[PDB]
Amino acid sequence: ITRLQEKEDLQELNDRLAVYIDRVRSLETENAGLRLRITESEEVVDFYFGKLRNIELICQENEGENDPVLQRIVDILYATD
Amino acid sequence: RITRLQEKEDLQELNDRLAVYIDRVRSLETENAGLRLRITESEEVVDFYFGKLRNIELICQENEGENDPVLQRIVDILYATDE
């Protein structure tokens, strides 16, 4: 239709393709980060779980003393929701 | 010059090159949402555990005066790291 139109029919198509390579590329990097954020979370779950487990042990160890502070702690440990 | 079959192939070829990019973005955006559920589901557990540890911290702090070595052992665990 125009000599300079075929220039912007060529360029429009080129820039449309570009934004797809820029999507795949940045979707690939977001994706990589999420894989590491998932490993970091699984690590923090264990780290916290370890603490709660050792705290449970110290409480079971002192069952005899019937300290109501330890019972309050145990009530927290075995809580739900 | 342009053969009637080279214009049939140049068409299909492009229409396929574009098709593998939409199929990449698609499956990449699918994988991305599956990672997002995974990380939010893990973070929910992190928060549940964090909540207990934090409430336990408060109890040890309000009994600071008691100087109970059991509580000190407990706060030692709370502030502990692997180094």
Author numbering:
A (entry chain B): 26 to 106
B (entry chain A): 25 to 107
Quote the authors verbatim.
Lamins represent a distinct class within the intermediate filament (IF) protein family. Lamin A (LA) and its splice variant lamin C as well as two closely related lamins B1 and B2 jointly form the lamina, a meshwork of ~3.5-nm-thick filaments located at the inner side of the nuclear envelope. Like for the whole IF family, the basic constitutive unit of the lamin filament is a rod-like dimer which results from a parallel coiled-coil (CC) structure. In line with this, the primary structure of lamins reveals a central α-helical domain responsible for the CC formation which is flanked by non-helical N- and C-terminal domains called the head and the tail respectively.
Three N-terminal constructs incorporated residues 1–70, 17–70 and 22–70 of human LA respectively, fused to residues 215–251 of the Eb1 protein (C-terminal cap). These constructs correspond to the complete or truncated LA head domain followed by the complete coil1A segment (predicted to start with residue 27 and end with residue 67) and the first three residues of linker L1. In contrast, the 1-70-Eb1 structure features an opened-up, ‘unzipped’ coil1A segment, even though the presence of the Eb1 cap keeps the two chains together at the C-terminus. The observed unzipping is especially interesting with respect to the possible mechanism of longitudinal IF assembly. The large differences observed in the dimer structure and crystal lattice contacts between the LA 17-70-Eb1 and LA 1-70-Eb1 structures are most likely due to the different crystallization conditions, rather than a consequence of the complete head being retained in the latter case. Indeed, since the head domain in the LA 1-70-Eb1 structure is almost entirely disordered, it does not seem likely that it plays a major role in the formation of the antiparallel overlap of two coil1A dimers. At the same time, the observed structure clearly reveals the weakness and plasticity of the N-terminal part of coil1A. In fact, the N-terminal opening-up of coil1A dimer is the most pronounced in the LA 1-70-Eb1 structure, followed by a smaller opening in the vimentin structure and a completely regular CC geometry in the 17-70-Eb1 construct.
